Amino acid sequence: SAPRPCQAPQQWEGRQVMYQQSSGRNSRALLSYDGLNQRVRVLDERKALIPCKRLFEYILLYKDGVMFQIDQATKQCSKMTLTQPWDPLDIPQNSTFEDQYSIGGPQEQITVQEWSDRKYETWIGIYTVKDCYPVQETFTINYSVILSTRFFDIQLGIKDPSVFTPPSTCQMAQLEKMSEDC
Amino acid sequence: APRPCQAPQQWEGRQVMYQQSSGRNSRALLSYDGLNQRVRVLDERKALIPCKRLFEYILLYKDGVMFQIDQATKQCSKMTLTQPWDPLDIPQNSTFEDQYSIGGPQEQITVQEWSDRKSARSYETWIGIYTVKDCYPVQETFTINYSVILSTRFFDIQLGIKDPSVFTPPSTCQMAQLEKMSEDC
């Protein structure tokens, strides 16, 4: 027979490195992922002091239809409507099985599997074999990367759920986006 | 402060190479022989969807040459090698960025991210992710003014080269086409 898809943990926090082709750049962030409540929080990290990217904090509530963008310094808020639907960090059953790799080398390694859902926008995810932790996600339109994103330092559960409760400023914030440049 | 480990300088495995020029990922087999300054790579096709035409590239940097070989007809292209040899290691001059852990608890590897930012007056930064215990390469990313021009992931690494004949070009490359050839069906 053929490999059957495992079940990704649906409550965990860790760190991400996200590449997007629109900018052509990498963004580091902390990432809280609560798939049980369809909600996700992310906090920009600066790598070195070279880009002055202006750090932000984004809170996405898909149970509602909304997301908040918060300057990390001034804490000023932007309320953005959420259009596209909730798309969880798991490997759906309908997905096909591409490949099984091993990362690292002979002494210290993990086995991982690459799956493709092709949800013509195609999605491809790499999750571990033993316990199904996410390592990488890639969304691609006609066979060119629009976005990929790497995950590490993952621990299960959410430590402090207040991460998901927006600051006082978002009680009545603008509606019209904020920049991301100094 | 973290000191850079020593990468293995002979291994074979598989690569996934992203290129921004194409915007695409290409899978291939990779034999890497940094002791002999030479590297061979053999295209793999994902599915039967792109008809990308498979190739085999052999890079001999000691002789300053590289050959591009059709996997079907075995026709060859000899292209002189310009930019110099750059091994898959973390040079000493490199600075230390971050230490991650991939996967989740129990089935995990710790890795270190290092950056050489090797200018050569253009400010092209190099960023490589290597394992912490025994220094195996997992990922390489070259970027010019802070946008990815090329990255490449490595897996299924075993040490040494099993059959070194991979590095001897086929009979046809003894006098090859001398220009580039296409990669399309």
Numbering used by the authors:
A (entry chain B): 37 to 155, 160 to 222
B (entry chain A): 38 to 222
What does the primary publication say about this deposited structure?
EPDR1 is a member of the ependymin-related (EPDR) family of proteins. The crystal structure confirms that EPDR1 adopts the highly curved β-sheet fold that had been previously observed only in bacterial proteins. Two EPDR1 chains associate into a tight homodimer through extensive hydrophilic contacts between the convex surfaces of shelf-II. At acidic pH, EPDR1 can bind to liposomes that contain the anionic lipid bis-monoacylglycero-phosphate (BMP) or the ganglioside GM1, consistent with a role in the degradation or transport of lipids and/or lipoproteins within the lysosome.
EPDR1 contains a single glycosylation site at residue Asn130 of loop L7 on the back-side of the glove. In the structure of glycosylated EPDR1, the hydrophobic grooves from the two monomers each contain a long continuous tube of electron density, which can be due to a copurifying lipid or a PEG molecule contributed from the crystallization solution. We were not able to identify copurifying lipids by mass spectroscopy. We modeled this ligand as an extended PEG chain; the U-shaped path of the unidentified ligand follows the floor of the groove and was similar in both protomers. The buried ligand is in van der Waals contact with the hydrophobic side chains of residues M54, L67, Y69, V76, V78, Y94, L96, Y98, M103 on shelf-I, F179, I181, I186, L187, F191 on shelf-II and W122 and L125 in L7. The rim of the groove is rich in charged and polar residues and there is a notable clustering of the conserved, exposed polar side chains D123, K155 and E161 at one end of the groove. Structures of EPDR1 with and without an unexpected bound ligand, likely to be a PEG molecule from the crystallization condition, identify an elongated, surface-exposed hydrophobic binding groove in each chain of the homodimer. All three of the crystallographically independent EPDR1 homodimers (one dimer from crystals of the glycosylated protein, and two dimers from crystals of the deglycosylated protein) are similar to each other with Cα RSMDs less than 0.6 Å, indicating little variability within the chains and across the homodimer interface. EPDR1 has two non-overlapping lipid-binding grooves on the same flat surface of the homodimer, and we presume that this allows the half dome-shaped protein to bind to membranes with an extensive contact surface for the binding and possible extraction and solubilization of target lipids.
